[PDB]
Design a protein around this ligand. Structure first.
Ligand SMILES: Nc1ncnc2c1ncn2[C@H]1C[C@H](O)[C@@H](COP(=O)(O)OP(=O)(O)OP(=O)(O)O)O1
Ligand SMILES: Nc1ncnc2c1ncn2[C@H]1C[C@H](O)[C@@H](COP(=O)(O)OP(=O)(O)OP(=O)(O)O)O1
Ligand SMILES: Nc1ncnc2c1ncn2[C@H]1C[C@H](O)[C@@H](COP(=O)(O)OP(=O)(O)OP(=O)(O)O)O1
Ligand SMILES: Nc1ncnc2c1ncn2[C@H]1C[C@H](O)[C@@H](COP(=O)(O)OP(=O)(O)OP(=O)(O)O)O1
Ligand SMILES: [Mg+2]
Ligand SMILES: [Mg+2]
Ligand SMILES: [Mg+2]
Ligand SMILES: [Mg+2]
Lengths: 472, 472, 472, 472
């Protein structure tokens, strides 16, 4: 059972909009919206979306596996060894939000301070004492962006696994000699940095020049979660405010995917006339180039929706019915919709490019979709005895080293329930960078934005006020 | 009763080192060390200090008043109007950590997200509706460092007040015409940005070229808190680890101030031989240039301690007894003391330059001194009925607008107990940027670092583990 | 008769290597090497080449016309209007080295100081008085690289003409309104800057992603000058020094073009065995990325010459027989050939990327190929009575305004003999930027590098010493 | 006889303004204006000046010696060794325009291409073969501004000599060990780069914080050339155009120096009323900050001429009688005087900051003052047999190595007639960087701007037109 199996199972159920049923449903963690800061929904005047991994949630592990295969094939076609063709995607290895250290070729799971929680070199998980040669303070400067790359999105899952596959391969293939910063093959030296760059380039290439989009659109039922409740929720949002789309994808791809998401023999409700996906938006903007979108952005262009090409010139006109925009900036949305930032709830899956940036640069209110939560919540509840034991052990230890061996063991067994790289949100009792960023920048979060359907228009989402230690 | 009166009253008391007395003393909030993240003191191998406003806590409001007067005098001497000489420092106006908006000439108190909590134009406190012309989303991009200046340190208190004095003066003096971004005096236009720069330049000048240091050292009892417990605590630290000083000040000034701080007719304890201040440090580093110190730093130099001048050349030698360093980097400390970052507890008063930077760049453990806490804690406890009422009102309102007028009123009355700009840490129920940064980057904090004297060597400082909303 | 007709006519003649015949031949300006600074050929130890427009001189106007057509087709395919398909390349319009002003949409011919010599808006040549609204000092800041683009190479001839075609089109098409900085088409505004960028992007696209290379290689006799004397001269160079190729082109294309250039039923001389083109080089380097090549360059890679793909990794080995390099830096050449800069004669056609940069950054000796000289020399000699009249008029005027109308007229008639944009090297008595840069950075220059064949190994190229006015 | 002795001897002579006398006088090279590009004086509408070393020509070697002494004293006061006090300025060592190589501690005299003409390490002049270890291609990348510093102005003569003194001292003092990039003194390493920076800082300090200005103004007759013909020429300029001053110096110093320059018991002519120096200018601008002045510049300020302080605010008014400006940009001059660049003749002594920048950035016409020419012209004429022999030897050698030993010897004997670093303009037959820059950027040049007095208002300065080798 993947997290997308969980999402599609809930997608298959029609909405029971009876008030009491809705209240009952949203008690379950799976259908809940979680609250980091209080938010009065009555004050939201605009609902903003992105498409990829928010409206269009790609099925797992099929879509990751497709991306992986195509990226591998691209590396082989540019000269990587034939053995890469024996690799096969393994969904049990990667967790999202890991950091690739391009100097030493390690995948690192870190906390908000850059402290090391896990370190894997290829598939070798390096124990604490042995990480000290390379990380003498068990720490990285995680904003040293020339050295460290943060794998934030679900699109980064294939490369997360591939990086580990490649380090493992070169390490164990006697044609190469392993060095601290890369591999020697006679008079050729491949640094981990250059290897990483090749992987990144190949992933970009697969998406923008290769066959990934074409292979996705030829089998949308295999690759994309589909939910009759989507048009219902968007139609309801439009009854109380404005609705917009700001996507990094292009118009041709957006139109294919969105047409699929709205392809039912009805509109918002069974029995209602089907309506084109575009009719659900007051403003549609493609090629957004987030995160630059939230600063200077790019020139505002108009899409010719017949051809899918941009009209020539910068668009200087007003918001009009049927127009589709390309590029621009977050100021375009505000200006054209007559909104200030706090009037907007932006619904994103990219912790950096959607959530952190809209919050910090523009003061937008935020909703983070975290698809893996659909399955992490099941693990959390099913294995809760392990976390609770860990908690008791931490308490007992603090109440002034056999206990320390036990803490490592329980931490490991708990973490393995999630995958080889553990929970998205923690390793044992230590929170991840990703968890910290979710708490700090996402006002609301959930396994799916669909969970807003279970709360009324006027709902006041509440979080407890925070007190400093000296105020308690 | 200023916060420095509180600190000096506690300074005047000799240490009662009986175990039970120490435990009893540190129960009181005034003598407590507060904990944001757990910290095992047994693991600290080095104790690091800065001097200004940490070891040498300048008395208030005398020292602020001196800085203010000298800065005013410098502005007049470069051509500002004679009316400035009628200004007098008012300690009830400024709170630390405000942001000066150089575009519109406002002092702003903001939360961690850049939301406006207070906005004052000169001495006019601008109500919420009226801030909307200049701040349509009641928000600033607080990292837009070309526009906004964050007044982080106690050295910034005089300029905080002076900026407000100047805006008030020019606004109400009929020689000038008030414009959105500055003042017109015939064919001269003074922007708030250029005014701010003149103030900043004059404060720097007073410190580095003018008479502030000379006037301070000629009356140290008036200007600097002095505590017989200082040598005691430093001597105890040196029994269990290494002790270092990294100060932005120069050696001549450092030697004058430190000699004063250690000028008692005894050493660590009454009855013990007096020892020179330098004997309390394994490493002494001046001209540190924090925050650059925590990145590339500057060339390591050696001070000639006879002359107070730098020896010519970069110092390439080892740590030796009696040597004093100048410049260098945080790596100098680690290398020469044989320490890794987590072995170090750095004791600072500069939330940005000492605490945030050492934590984020180097993974040092941190202790933030907050001198104002010595008096804010008294207000917090004495006026607790007001905060508690505010809390109940927030609860009652949330449990689904006469109440909203009451929330504004109680928020205002509470805030005024601290000063015209409120508590360092909050406005009503909203936490400040400074509070957020204290919680995020300072592992420990207190009104004085002296409060470490009341905890044993082995102490385990404990903070509760943090859970995400979906983990609760 | 195009300049390439002249070059191919001389190419068709076999070499008569008799000493007296060679001396006689090199007296004619067409077969001469011209000298800006003295150069002792005996001191040259390495001869360096580029390929495009040096070894491989594309035929004119056929190749320009092909580039033009394909660029037009690309613009139409991305949404430019269908009328562009009626454009046809006109070799009589563009001269090389013009500056496009992206603010006002003008092609400018300037001197070394940025003084305006010609200004054309579309096909409207703007008289002096009328240029003053846009250029009040008849001057541009020609290093303001964000505004001005210098069209240095023969590859830039199609876009030179196309830019003028586009400004003319939009100006005269009543669908658009002409503004100072671009064109309005309803709610779309196309700046001259964005138009320019589209043209530049389309030219790049045609070369790197489109069909230009494929169409060139399918008819090499139509598109590329071929000369049996090439292998002869390169073989002679190799008898007295080392020979290298540093080309911005890729290996696959290089191999196709070079194989064509050496495809004769003989090697260096008639009667000799044919040898592969690679055998004529001690070092072959592709993907050079000049001008970056002459600074930091890029990582040194090795080409797999079977596949045409790069081997994975940086190449750390020595110079070996049969190896082909990719990327690297000018230091690669020096290190691997055991050369210092003054030992190298680099033979280039790019005044900036080959000549100025190798001279200024590395102190290489330089030879500039200027293919248009093959026809400009004919005009210069045939119309010499016009220049001589201009000279006499300048003299007579200086010897203290009917004469000034005559100077404009004669200047215009002279310039028109070269084309609508005049000589590469001057407008009337004023030298162009290009001329100045040739004199300043090219030690030697000629219509073809083949002209070195007519000078012996030991030749001392001589230029007169320069004296300052006060030294004369 | 120094160059300033020559200038003051000519200064002492009253002007004979008879037409025939003026024509006769300007035939002599000493009183001539030299012409790099033709310039019609009738077209000049504004005459612009700088003060230091143009209007105010400091006497030599007295002023250099003063600067040297004060700089030495400053270095000793910050910790340099006492032996520096034994140094004494030697005017026979430095020539202007040398390059200090901060890596290897050499003074270099280079041509326009960065080729080495002379290399001195301290006072050791390094022969050609021995320069090859450090400069393998006898070349530097002279725009590598982090490594190389170009000593352009007469203010740089003291530091030119001091740098050589210091390298010599440390090299020969057995307390220090000489290394490739600096000197070791036990555990202190002084790089040539840090030494250079100390010298540069000390020269700045002497000028802006120390006693140089005060010592100059207390003995102006010792330190500043004074000429009754100055007011005459400026008065004549004002009869036919506008006159402005743009100086990097401050108003207080400018007023002292200018008052001295105009302190005669007459105005322009004997018998005429004395007039204040300010009356000779339509526009007076101080604190110009050239070269930044010719780009963005700084905020335009107004000087209070009573106090010498800046009025507070940016000056937004028109040009008015008696106003004095500070900061601004070259656009300030043009706007306020109603001039375009080619209407302006700017008279400067700084080849980079006055001449190159005004020409290249703004298209101003230029006049370079070169005070040393007043004595170099005497050497040039007196030792002309040596240059002529060198010329004949170059000719004879070229007409196909005993001759090469003779060329080195004659080159050396010629160069020594100018000083140990040779002529400003050449070493033997090779022109210097400075010479090249004079020819390229200075339209006119002379030993003094006073030489304009000897040419009528309408004069047409003529230079021969330049032809390319293929045009001859
Ligand atoms: N999730 C992320 N992915 C990629 N880059 C990130 C991410 N979070 C932060 N950064 C980058 C942007 C900045 O260059 C740098 C500063 O990060 P840091 O200050 O440590 O984190 P933060 O949570 O305070 O966010 P911010 O970066 O916006 O300040 O790190
Ligand atoms: N207290 C402060 N004083 C001055 N500048 C600050 C302060 N805090 C942050 N900055 C600056 C440094 C960066 O340019 C920018 C980024 O800040 P921001 O990311 O919002 O805060 P933060 O608490 O995440 O710290 P950081 O700046 O280190 O990421 O703001
Ligand atoms: N032919 C050219 N093509 C493109 N850019 C040029 C060319 N010549 C010079 N530049 C650019 C590089 C620099 O940014 C800037 C400085 O030019 P400038 O100093 O005026 O010319 P130059 O002949 O002295 O060469 P250089 O640029 O190398 O100094 O202009
Ligand atoms: N006389 C000088 N003094 C200081 N810097 C100089 C001087 N001449 C040139 N430069 C600097 C400015 C640029 O960074 C760099 C480029 O110089 P270069 O192109 O070789 O000389 P140039 O005579 O063509 O002038 P420019 O620098 O303006 O292009 O060198
Ligand atoms: Mg997305
Ligand atoms: Mg401090
Ligand atoms: Mg080429
Ligand atoms: Mg000057």
């Amino acid at each position: 059972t993947s997290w997308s199996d969980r999402l599609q199972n809930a997608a298959d159920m029609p909405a029971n909009m009876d008030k009491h049923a809705l209240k009952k449903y949203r008690r379950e963690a799976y259908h809940r919206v979680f609250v980091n800061r209080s938010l009065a929904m009555e004050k939201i005047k605009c609902f903003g979306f992105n498409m990829d991994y928010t409206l269009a949630v790609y099925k797992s592990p099929e879509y990751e596996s497709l991306g992986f295969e195509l990226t591998v094939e691209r590396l082989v076609s540019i000269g990587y060894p034939q053995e890469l063709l024996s690799f096969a995607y393994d969904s049990t290895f990667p967790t999202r939000g890991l950091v690739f250290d391009t100097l030493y070729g390690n995948l690192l799971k870190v906390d908000a301070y850059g402290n090391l929680l896990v370190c894997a070199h290829g598939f070798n998980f390096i124990r604490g004492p042995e990480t000290r040669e390379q990380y003498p303070n068990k720490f990285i400067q995680r904003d040293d962006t020339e050295r460290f790359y943060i794998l934030n999105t679900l699109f980064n899952l294939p490369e997360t696994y591939l990086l580990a596959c490649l380090v493992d391969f070169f390490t164990n293939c006697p044609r190469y000699t392993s060095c601290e910063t890369g591999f020697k093959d006679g008079d050729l030296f491949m640094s981990y940095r250059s290897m990483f760059q090749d992987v990144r380039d190949a992933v970009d290439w697969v998406h923008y020049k290769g066959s990934l989009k074409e292979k996705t659109v030829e089998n949308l039922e295999k690759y994309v979660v589909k939910d009759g409740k989507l048009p219902l929720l968007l139609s309801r949002m439009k009854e109380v405010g404005k609705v917009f789309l700001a996507t990094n994808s292009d118009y041709k791809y957006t139109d294919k995917i969105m047409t699929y998401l709205f392809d039912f023999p009805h509109g918002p409700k069974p029995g209602s006339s089907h309506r084109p996906w575009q009719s659900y938006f007051d403003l549609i903007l493609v090629d957004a180039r987030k995160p630059l979108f939230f600063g200077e952005g790019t020139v505002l262009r108009q899409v010719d929706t017949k051809t899918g090409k941009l009209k020539i010139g910068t668009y200087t006109g007003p918001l009009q019915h049927g127009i589709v925009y390309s590029g621009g900036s977050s100021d375009t949305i505000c200006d054209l919709l007559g909104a200030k930032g706090k009037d907007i709830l932006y619904i994103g899956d990219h912790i950096f490019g959607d959530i952190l940036k809209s919050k910090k640069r523009q003061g937008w209110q935020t909703f983070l979709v975290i698809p893996e939560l659909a399955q992490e919540l099941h693990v959390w509840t099913d294995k809760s005895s392990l976390f609770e034991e860990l908690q008791s052990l931490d308490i007992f230890l603090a109440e002034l080293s056999s206990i320390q061996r036990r803490i490592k063991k329980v931490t490991h067994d708990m973490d393995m329930c999630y995958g080889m790289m553990g929970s998205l949100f923690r390793s044992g009792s230590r929170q991840t960078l990703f968890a910290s960023q979710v708490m700090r920048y996402a006002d609301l979060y959930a396994a799916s934005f669909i969970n807003l359907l279970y709360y009324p228009f006027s709902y006041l989402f509440r979080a407890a006020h925070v007190l400093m230690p000296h105020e308690s």
